[PDB]
Ligand binder design. Structure first.
Ligand SMILES: N[C@@H](CCC(=O)N[C@@H](CS[C@H]1c2ccccc2-c2ccccc2[C@@H]1O)C(=O)NCC(=O)O)C(=O)O
Ligand SMILES: N[C@@H](CCC(=O)N[C@@H](CS[C@H]1c2ccccc2-c2ccccc2[C@@H]1O)C(=O)NCC(=O)O)C(=O)O
Ligand SMILES: N[C@@H](CCC(=O)N[C@@H](CS[C@H]1c2ccccc2-c2ccccc2[C@@H]1O)C(=O)NCC(=O)O)C(=O)O
Ligand SMILES: N[C@@H](CCC(=O)N[C@@H](CS[C@H]1c2ccccc2-c2ccccc2[C@@H]1O)C(=O)NCC(=O)O)C(=O)O
Lengths: 217, 217
């Protein structure tokens, strides 16, 4: 089987866990523990960080027989290629490439706020700008069923994660954007995904590592 | 022609400027000014940020007739696809995807240090870890002429930029890694690139925006 390795948190690996599920991939997971305070021991991972044969050791990592892959987006495109979940025309490739990169920037901005010691101050300011972020995703989707167009691709997995994390943070955030509420529902309605969400393999939370100031531990 | 828009700094756009050059693309550049202190006025860009028809307005942006693209990596893959500068086998696609994402993480870590108010403190600590980063790039390249293998691809443009920025920061950093010194030289020896470096279109510096604590203004 493929081996997926990552911390015992949702972090930036939810889309990969979801895609492995969707595609019916045979896999095993290693979920590394993180020390509690104050030294947040990472010994468990650091012991093996250089013993796995990865080119640029990192978490997450995917091991597929001879292929050893790091960088979340790279793991996403490898599974995409194997299962034909890429854009098939130039317009679709474009949309996929922009959104891939935009889904990372949206996740990183949320992580910045949640990890800052002055969270209680940043939260309000993050929320102020939330209607603009959501609007741009909503206008992008339009009346299409999925982000690339008529076909589900791997980017729908990463945008689902951005949306989900934001609705956990601020439950009301999708109410003024119905195509986005609808997308969430439709993604959560795919059989393999609803089965997974009800299984003991599921890990929705915590999102962030234990030092976060909002949902880490 | 295509329109490339970005701040009047090197920032994360050097690879795009280089690739436009390499490929002999017909283009025009808009380079936006940034206010000097303390308010670092961005009015010049913000005036047009929403008037260009971009889906997720950002800098850099590329306009190619009907296509309007944001996110640096997305702009890189669009030019790559048009000019056949992608990996052609699965092993090559993999390498390209990992390095694309790893070149971003290396650039972001350098930017974090250069932008921190406590730079003079971070510099030493960044340097301590530099031999490990360089080693991993060097072992990755091996005896190949380019990063993907035998073919130049767009990732060579982004890794060239990482390497160049680091040798500006710490001139001695490539001396213990000759395949990396050699790659730099070979990239800088391509005709279109050496012509560009000597033209009035060239912008090597400043790297960072004016609020940086090391090379911004
Ligand atoms: N891709 C389908 C496959 C579904 C799937 O991969 N189940 C695994 C067992 S599940 C996994 C695991 C994943 C997450 C959390 C825990 C576990 C786990 C727990 C106890 C014992 C073994 C495990 C394992 O580490 C399995 O063994 N499948 C057949 C095989 O690999 O030949 C789906 O994604 O829905
Ligand atoms: N661009 C890469 C980035 C790879 C990378 O940074 N990995 C972090 C873990 S990922 C990150 C994160 C990002 C967003 C949301 C949460 C997390 C997170 C969660 C739990 C614990 C640590 C984190 C972190 O804050 C890691 O711990 N690396 C092992 C190492 O450094 O030895 C990728 O897309 O794959
Ligand atoms: N891709 C080849 C093409 C080379 C190329 O694109 N030169 C542009 C003029 S150059 C550009 C510019 C680029 C950077 C900085 C300044 C300028 C600039 C300055 C004054 C007046 C016009 C300009 C313009 O904004 C040109 O007009 N070429 C023919 C055309 O577009 O049909 C190369 O990359 O080496
Ligand atoms: N993931 C995206 C990221 C797009 C993005 O963040 N763009 C910044 C400029 S880029 C950044 C930077 C990153 C690394 C090195 C330097 C810079 C930089 C230089 C000058 C001035 C501002 C900067 C910044 O610190 C910008 O100003 N956006 C317009 C806006 O926000 O309205 C991409 O890869 O394309």
């Amino acid at each position: 089987p493929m081996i997926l390795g990552y911390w015992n948190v949702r972090g930036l690996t939810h889309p990969i866990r979801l895609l492995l599920e969707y595609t019916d991939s045979s896999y095993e997971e290693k979920r590394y523990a993180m020390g509690d305070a104050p030294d947040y021991d990472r010994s468990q991972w650091l012991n093996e960080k250089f013993k796995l044969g990865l080119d640029f050791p990192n978490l997450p990592y995917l091991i597929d027989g001879s292929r050893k892959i790091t960088q979340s987006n790279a793991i996403m495109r490898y599974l995409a290629r194997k299962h034909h979940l890429c854009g098939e025309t130039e317009e679709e490739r474009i949309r996929v490439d922009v959104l891939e990169n935009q889904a990372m920037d949206t996740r990183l901005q949320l992580a910045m706020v949640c990890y800052s010691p002055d969270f209680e101050r940043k939260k309000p300011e993050y929320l102020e700008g939330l209607p603009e972020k959501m609007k741009l995703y909503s206008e992008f989707l339009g009346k299409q069923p999925w982000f690339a167009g008529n076909k589900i691709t791997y980017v729908d997995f990463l945008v689902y994660d951005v949306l989900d994390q934001h609705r956990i943070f601020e439950p009301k955030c999708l109410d003024a954007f119905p195509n986005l509420k609808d997308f969430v529902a439709r993604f959560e309605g795919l059989k393999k995904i609803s089965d997974y969400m009800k299984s003991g393999r599921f890990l929705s939370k915590p999102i962030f590592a234990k030092m976060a100031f909002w949902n880490p531990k």
